[PDB]
Amino acid sequence: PQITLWKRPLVTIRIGGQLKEALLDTGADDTVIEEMNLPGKWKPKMIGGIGGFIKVRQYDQIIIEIAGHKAIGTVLVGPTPVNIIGRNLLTQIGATLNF
Amino acid sequence: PQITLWKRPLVTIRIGGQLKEALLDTGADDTVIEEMNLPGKWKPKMIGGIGGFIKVRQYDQIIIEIAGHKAIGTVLVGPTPVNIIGRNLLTQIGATLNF
Numbered sequence: 001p002q003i004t005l006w007k008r009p010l011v012t013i014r015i016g017g018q019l020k021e022a023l024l025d026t027g028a029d030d031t032v033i034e035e036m037n038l039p040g041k042w043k044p045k046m047i048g049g050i051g052g053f054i055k056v057r058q059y060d061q062i063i064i065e066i067a068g069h070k071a072i073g074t075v076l077v078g079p080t081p082v083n084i085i086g087r088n089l090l091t092q093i094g095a096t097l098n099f
Numbered sequence: 100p101q102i103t104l105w106k107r108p109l110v111t112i113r114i115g116g117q118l119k120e121a122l123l124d125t126g127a128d129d130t131v132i133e134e135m136n137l138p139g140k141w142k143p144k145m146i147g148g149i150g151g152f153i154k155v156r157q158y159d160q161i162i163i164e165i166a167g168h169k170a171i172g173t174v175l176v177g178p179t180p181v182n183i184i185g186r187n188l189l190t191q192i193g194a195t196l197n198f
């Protein structure tokens with residue numbers, strides 16, 4: 001769809017079989033999801049945002065449904081304030097900004 | 100214009116008589132600009148993201164040009180690592196996310 005920005009662009013995702021709410025976030029390079037059990041191997045990594053750096057678990061090649069569209073790619077799991085869908089997966093679902 | 104998300108969606112803005120590069124950021128409620136010496140009244144604010152919070156100065160009714168489009172609204176000024184155009188101004192320039 002076309003999504004206007006008067007409200008937060010929140011969508012439902014399915015990850016590891018579980019439904020969650022997530023924010024479509026063009027300012028995020030990477031997708032970052034709150035702490036959860038996720039099947040797959042992972043690697044320790046760190047990422048930085050506006051307020052500093054956090055530790056995350058990097059899971060590669062994770063199958064995730066975003067607003068009914070399929071993506072398969074990297075999901076960082078850790079203590080983010082908000083579940084965020086970043087450009088690595090927005091590009092997979094063909095998302096663009098338009099004005 | 101259409102902006103794909105392979106790379107960071109950076110555009111040129113003009114604020115307080117200065118040109119800067121800024122992110123078109125659907126994940127930000129508010130616009131946050133790197134420290135600059137803006138004139139006028141402001142109110143203290145703290146905003147949080149990955150890593151924690153930063154202290155910013157909230158300026159209202161600030162005129163800003165974004166990729167050639169005029170806008171006027173609230174701009175938060177503080178030690179952000181990137182200039183961020185948030186939804187408060189993205190709506191004014193008619194920006195949508197589409198997939």
Ligand SMILES: CC(C)CN(C[C@@H](O)[C@H](Cc1ccccc1)NC(=O)O[C@H]1CO[C@H]2OCC[C@H]21)S(=O)(=O)c1ccc(N)cc1
Pocket residue numbers: 023025026027028029030031032047048049050051082084086124126127128129130131146147148149180181183185
């Ligand atoms: C976490 C979001 C809910 C909110 N943020 C906007 C978000 O787009 C930031 C915007 C952003 C961009 C770069 C640096 C800091 C913040 N991106 C971000 O944290 O992305 C992280 C995940 O991918 C990585 O790529 C960029 C940093 C990492 S935020 O910058 O913290 C923020 C919070 C409140 C306001 N008013 C404005 C911005």
